[PDB]
Design an enzyme around this catalytic site. Structure first.
Site, PDB file in Angstrom:
ATOM      1  N   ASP A  72     -13.909   5.702  50.784  1.00 51.98           N
ATOM      2  CA  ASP A  72     -13.990   4.576  51.736  1.00 51.98           C
ATOM      3  C   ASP A  72     -12.592   4.169  52.250  1.00 51.98           C
ATOM      4  O   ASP A  72     -12.192   2.993  52.158  1.00 51.98           O
ATOM      5  CB  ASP A  72     -14.683   3.378  51.080  1.00 51.98           C
ATOM      6  CG  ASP A  72     -15.934   3.763  50.319  1.00 51.98           C
ATOM      7  OD1 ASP A  72     -16.705   4.635  50.783  1.00 51.98           O
ATOM      8  OD2 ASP A  72     -16.165   3.177  49.242  1.00 51.98           O
TER       9      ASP A  72
ATOM     10  N   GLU B 131     -24.544   2.361  56.700  1.00 52.18           N
ATOM     11  CA  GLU B 131     -23.465   1.570  56.073  1.00 52.18           C
ATOM     12  C   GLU B 131     -22.101   1.913  56.679  1.00 52.18           C
ATOM     13  O   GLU B 131     -22.043   2.667  57.642  1.00 52.18           O
ATOM     14  CB  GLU B 131     -23.473   1.729  54.541  1.00 52.18           C
ATOM     15  CG  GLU B 131     -23.055   3.115  54.051  1.00 52.18           C
ATOM     16  CD  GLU B 131     -23.255   3.301  52.551  1.00 52.18           C
ATOM     17  OE1 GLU B 131     -23.804   2.394  51.883  1.00 52.18           O
ATOM     18  OE2 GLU B 131     -22.840   4.357  52.031  1.00 52.18           O
TER      19      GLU B 131
HETATM   20  O1  LIG Z   1     -23.821   2.939  48.767  1.00 54.16           O
HETATM   21  C1  LIG Z   1     -24.430   1.779  48.232  1.00 54.16           C
HETATM   22  C2  LIG Z   1     -25.908   2.066  48.049  1.00 54.16           C
HETATM   23  O2  LIG Z   1     -26.054   3.056  46.994  1.00 54.16           O
HETATM   24  C3  LIG Z   1     -27.390   3.547  47.178  1.00 54.16           C
HETATM   25  O3  LIG Z   1     -28.407   2.542  46.956  1.00 54.16           O
HETATM   26  C4  LIG Z   1     -28.743   2.284  45.556  1.00 54.16           C
HETATM   27  C5  LIG Z   1     -29.789   1.157  45.553  1.00 54.16           C
HETATM   28  O4  LIG Z   1     -29.134  -0.048  46.061  1.00 54.16           O
HETATM   29  C6  LIG Z   1     -29.576  -1.201  45.266  1.00 54.16           C
HETATM   30  O5  LIG Z   1     -30.087  -2.241  46.118  1.00 54.16           O
HETATM   31  C7  LIG Z   1     -30.676  -0.696  44.332  1.00 54.16           C
HETATM   32  O6  LIG Z   1     -30.578  -1.385  43.077  1.00 54.16           O
HETATM   33  C8  LIG Z   1     -30.338   0.785  44.169  1.00 54.16           C
HETATM   34  O7  LIG Z   1     -31.546   1.517  43.947  1.00 54.16           O
HETATM   35  C9  LIG Z   1     -27.361   3.888  48.668  1.00 54.16           C
HETATM   36  O8  LIG Z   1     -26.643   5.113  48.852  1.00 54.16           O
HETATM   37  C10 LIG Z   1     -26.569   2.721  49.278  1.00 54.16           C
HETATM   38  O9  LIG Z   1     -27.466   1.782  49.874  1.00 54.16           O
HETATM   39  O1  LIG Z   2     -18.195   4.086  47.716  1.00 54.37           O
HETATM   40  C1  LIG Z   2     -18.546   2.773  47.283  1.00 54.37           C
HETATM   41  C2  LIG Z   2     -19.710   2.225  48.125  1.00 54.37           C
HETATM   42  O2  LIG Z   2     -20.617   3.350  48.335  1.00 54.37           O
HETATM   43  C3  LIG Z   2     -20.799   3.474  49.752  1.00 54.37           C
HETATM   44  O3  LIG Z   2     -22.138   3.830  49.976  1.00 54.37           O
HETATM   45  C4  LIG Z   2     -20.586   2.077  50.312  1.00 54.37           C
HETATM   46  O4  LIG Z   2     -20.309   2.145  51.721  1.00 54.37           O
HETATM   47  C5  LIG Z   2     -19.361   1.674  49.527  1.00 54.37           C
HETATM   48  O5  LIG Z   2     -19.307   0.243  49.525  1.00 54.37           O
END
Ligand SMILES: OC[C@@H]1O[C@@H](OC[C@@H]2O[C@@H](O)[C@H](O)[C@H]2O)[C@H](O)[C@H]1O
Ligand SMILES: OC[C@@H]1O[C@@H](O)[C@H](O)[C@H]1O
Ligand SMILES: OC[C@@H]1O[C@@H](OC[C@@H]2O[C@@H](O)[C@H](O)[C@H]2O)[C@H](O)[C@H]1O
Ligand SMILES: OC[C@@H]1O[C@@H](OC[C@@H]2O[C@@H](O)[C@H](O)[C@H]2O)[C@H](O)[C@H]1O
Ligand SMILES: [Cl-]
Ligand code: NA
Length: 447
Positions: free
Chosen positions: A12, A188
């Site tokens: 990031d 994202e």
């Molecule tokens: O990159 C941040 C996030 O990680 C993954 O989502 C995981 C998901 O997010 C929480 O709300 C839940 O607890 C868990 O299952 C995706 O790659 C992204 O949205």
């Molecule tokens: O890399 C850490 C987190 O994972 C990514 O998916 C999000 O953009 C960042 O906040």
């Protein structure tokens, strides 16, 4: 040129070019426990710039877990850092936070917490970025719309100050396309670049594995950016995995500019292998990379493909046809304008395969393939280790024949007296005798 990667174990990436002659670089560290910062007068200088930890997670409560994706901005005389964090109680209760400093040097300066960025909906939120369009500052971020069955969608809002939105957010993208919904349904990491009166908002989609990629929204700078109808979503990714260059899951990008301010630079992370090893959240091998953005004739950005590790490739334009570039099609080399498939027109200059101080020109999209002549015609073909190939793919770099000062010409190593030249747009090696021959055999690198 850049040398990739810029930084191992940094995800990031955010780079900000300041008016004090420095670039400032922050990123997500694998421990997810702190905000680091480094600075250097040039982009390449960042690779060996020492990091200072400017802020560390709280021992308990909010801002205590999953310290993710910091960005550093200079706004109205002060420094601001935008980051995301969960709590020690609920590590997945991620929200957006801001730090402020009035110090000249943000590495050594003191930082003040400005608290959580409030939003009407209390839900998973991260990846805040800020930008200005025509004197109006906006915030863009990723957040769960609880009425949608997904992870995060993209939001935008005006700002009352660097840590507070004004009015209501607008949802401007949700993950619905096949390439946005692999593993998780995610938009994202929004990031904004502006060019030609258009605003391009790139973002990351799908899971953070090899499927990670960049999408893009486009709008006119004259439009209401809070009206979702202002934004058009690209139907395909604008940046994605390249098995050929061994670059997997490129994403979470930012934008900066070159030393001279004239080129836009794409800043992103990726891995050099496909399959995640161990607990996905815990795989620490994302690395930060840099490559120049090229602008298409139609005003849209061209990110090409994530380039091979090492030195970045360049483009060669013709002296007499300045809009035409050396490119390959069905592996035959030609000069051509408005190259849509950008990487067909990118080559890196390497030590000559036949040695003796010569050079060779390696394809960016076909590593291990080179510009070579056969029957005096120029093709892009795979090095097979033969003496014939090495000889056919090696050239003496010469001063340009029509521009000794700034141009370049390429004399065959195995056929001295013959130069790379275009004829009916196709590239050949031939002797040079006339004014036109000299122009046909002169090129410019990165002009
Ligand atoms: O990159 C941040 C996030 O990680 C993954 O989502 C995981 C998901 O997010 C929480 O709300 C839940 O607890 C868990 O299952 C995706 O790659 C992204 O949205
Ligand atoms: O890399 C850490 C987190 O994972 C990514 O998916 C999000 O953009 C960042 O906040
Ligand atoms: O020069 C190699 C390669 O050729 C171009 O693609 C060829 C094109 O793709 C198929 O769909 C068609 O059958 C074939 O003519 C690429 O631009 C370049 O990388
Ligand atoms: O490679 C482009 C150009 O081709 C050669 O000229 C041949 C012919 O005459 C010109 O008027 C047209 O551009 C082309 O079809 C030249 O050697 C080279 O500059
Ligand atoms: Cl093309
Ligand atoms: Na970001």
């Amino acid at each position: 040129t850049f040398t990739n990667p810029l930084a191992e174990k940094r995800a990031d990436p955010h780079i900000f070019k300041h008016t004090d002659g420095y670039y400032y670089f922050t990123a997500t560290v694998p421990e997810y426990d702190r905000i680091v910062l480094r600075r250097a007068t040039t982009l390449q200088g960042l690779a060996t710039a020492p990091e200072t930890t400017i802020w560390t997670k709280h021992a308990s409560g909010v801002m205590g877990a999953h310290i993710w994706a910091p960005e550093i901005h200079f706004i109205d005389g002060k420094w601001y850092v935008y980051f995301a964090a969960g709590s020690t109680s609920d590590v997945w209760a991620i929200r957006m936070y801001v730090l402020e400093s009035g110090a000249a040097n943000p590495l050594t300066g003191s930082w003040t917490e400005k608290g959580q960025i409030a939003t009407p909906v209390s839900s998973f939120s991260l990846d805040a970025t800020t930008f200005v369009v025509n004197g109006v500052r906006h915030l863009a971020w990723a957040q769960r719309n609880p009425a949608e069955d997904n992870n995060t969608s993209l939001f935008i809002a005006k700002m009352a100050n660097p840590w507070t939105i004004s009015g209501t957010p607008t949802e401007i993208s949700q993950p619905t396309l096949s390439w946005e919904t692999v593993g998780y349904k995610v938009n994202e990491g929004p990031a904004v670049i502006q060019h030609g009166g258009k605003v391009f908002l790139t973002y990351s989609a799908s899971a953070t594995d090899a499927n990670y990629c960049l999408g893009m929204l486009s709008a006119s700078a004259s439009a209401d950016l809070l009206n979702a109808a202002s934004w058009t979503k690209s139907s395909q990714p604008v940046f994605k995995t390249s098995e050929a260059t061994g670059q997997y899951g490129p994403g979470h990008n930012s934008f900066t500019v070159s030393e001279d301010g004239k080129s836009d630079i794409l800043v992103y992370h990726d891995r050099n292998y496909k399959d995640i090893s161990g607990d996905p959240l815990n795989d620490p091998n994302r690395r930060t990379r840099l490559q120049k953005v090229y602008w298409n004739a139609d005003g849209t950005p061209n990110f090409g493909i994530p380039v091979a590790d090492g030195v970045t490739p360049v483009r060669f334009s013709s002296y007499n046809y300045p809009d035409r570039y050396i490119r390959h099609w069905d592996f035959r080399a030609r000069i051509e304008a408005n190259v849509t498939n950008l990487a067909d027109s990118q080559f890196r200059v390497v030590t000559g395969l036949a040695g003796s101080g010569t050079i060779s020109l390696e394809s960016a999209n076909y590593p291990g393939y080179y510009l070579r002549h056969k029957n005096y015609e120029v093709w892009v073909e795979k090095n097979d280790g033969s003496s014939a190939f090495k000889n056919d793919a090696s050239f003496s770099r010469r001063a340009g024949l029509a521009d000794s000062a700034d141009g370049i010409a390429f004399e065959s190593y195995n056929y001295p007296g013959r130069y790379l030249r275009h004829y009916e747009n196709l590239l050949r090696i031939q002797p040079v005798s006339t004014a036109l021959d000299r122009q046909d055999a002169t090129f410019y690198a990165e002009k």
